[PDB]
């Protein structure tokens, strides 16, 4: 791993955390009280990619598990999904556009664009208890912004 990983959690702009309600399924909802222990933790890693001025390609891989978020097409329709990669070869300096997310910073908020399908970012449903997914809606009603938080281990 000739790179630098970063342990950090993720929260939406409405104050909600992400939880692994299933193997390859995550859900974003309100979390508070001792029930916070039900919060997942990702591991951001700075990788190589379209190094722009505000674009920072990284890799979000569950710390404990070896699942790496990936943008795949489901009938010509981009979507978000968890794909178990090699727990030995990953992470690394280079990554497939699928595991590469351009971390952008706008209005003091973060926006992850699928290095594979530009214009499509990671969004959540304002609704309560809903699976996370990839949406092609810059703002509007879908919550595409987010908030990362460094942690320790």
């Amino acid at each position: 791993a000739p790179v630098r990983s970063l342990n950090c959690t993720l929260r939406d702009s409405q104050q909600k955390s992400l939880v692994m309600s299933g193997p390859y399924e995550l859900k974003a909802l309100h979390l508070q009280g001792q029930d916070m222990e039900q919060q997942v933790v990702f591991s951001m890693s700075f990788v190589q990619g379209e190094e722009s001025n505000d674009k920072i390609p990284v890799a979000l891989g569950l710390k404990e598990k070896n699942l790496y978020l990936s943008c795949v097409l489901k009938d010509d329709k981009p979507t978000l999904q968890l794909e178990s990669v090699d727990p030995k070869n990953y992470p690394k300096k280079k990554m497939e556009k699928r595991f590469v997310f351009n971390k952008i910073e706008i209005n003091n908020k973060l926006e992850f664009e699928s290095a594979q399908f530009p214009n499509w970012y990671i969004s959540t449903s304002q609704a309560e208890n809903m699976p996370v997914f990839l949406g092609g809606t810059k703002g509007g009603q879908d919550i595409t912004d987010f908030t990362m938080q460094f942690v320790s281990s």
Side-chain angles (χ1 to χ4, degrees):
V3 223
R4 304 187 65 61
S5 325
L6 242 63
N7 300 191
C8 51
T9 57
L10 274 171
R11 244 166 66 270
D12 82 330
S13 62
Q14 205 182 200
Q15 211 204 262
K16 316 209 300 306
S17 298
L18 316 187
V19 335
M20 66 336 191
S21 215
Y24 315 104
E25 275 177 81
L26 284 155
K27 293 191 178 302
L29 39 61
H30 295 97
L31 200 68
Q32 177 274 2
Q34 335 196 55
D35 194 286
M36 83 199 88
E37 59 185 318
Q38 306 180 177
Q39 68 194 26
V40 178
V41 189
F42 314 84
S43 187
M44 190 178 284
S45 288
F46 300 108
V47 301
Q48 190 71 272
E50 303 194 65
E51 185 178 286
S52 206
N53 176 65
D54 253 56
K55 299 200 193 300
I56 295 150
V58 302
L60 293 151
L62 314 192
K63 184 177 159 181
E64 298 183 277
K65 322 188 175 302
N66 52 350
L67 293 150
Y68 288 64
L69 284 66
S70 57
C71 324
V72 304
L73 283 166
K74 284 173 60 38
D75 321 322
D76 321 338
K77 215 83 214 181
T79 297
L80 198 90
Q81 192 175 142
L82 294 153
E83 187 115 65
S84 309
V85 309
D86 200 59
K88 289 186 298 87
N89 310 162
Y90 287 105
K92 37 163 65 282
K93 162 158 294 337
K94 178 168 59 273
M95 275 286 254
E96 309 188 21
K97 261 56 145 300
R98 328 203 173 54
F99 317 110
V100 187
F101 287 81
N102 298 144
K103 154 162 153 161
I104 319 186
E105 259 172 70
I106 305 182
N107 280 30
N108 315 48
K109 289 270 175 184
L110 295 153
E111 277 179 34
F112 299 92
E113 194 183 275
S114 173
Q116 202 179 159
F117 324 108
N119 323 107
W120 289 84
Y121 319 74
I122 312 180
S123 319
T124 32
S125 182
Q126 187 179 119
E128 297 178 317
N129 189 47
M130 252 179 169
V132 180
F133 60 100
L134 214 72
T137 326
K138 300 149 290 238
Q141 173 273 135
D142 300 324
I143 308 180
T144 60
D145 45 39
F146 267 96
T147 58
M148 185 171 79
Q149 272 287 10
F150 276 66
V151 300
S152 306
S153 297

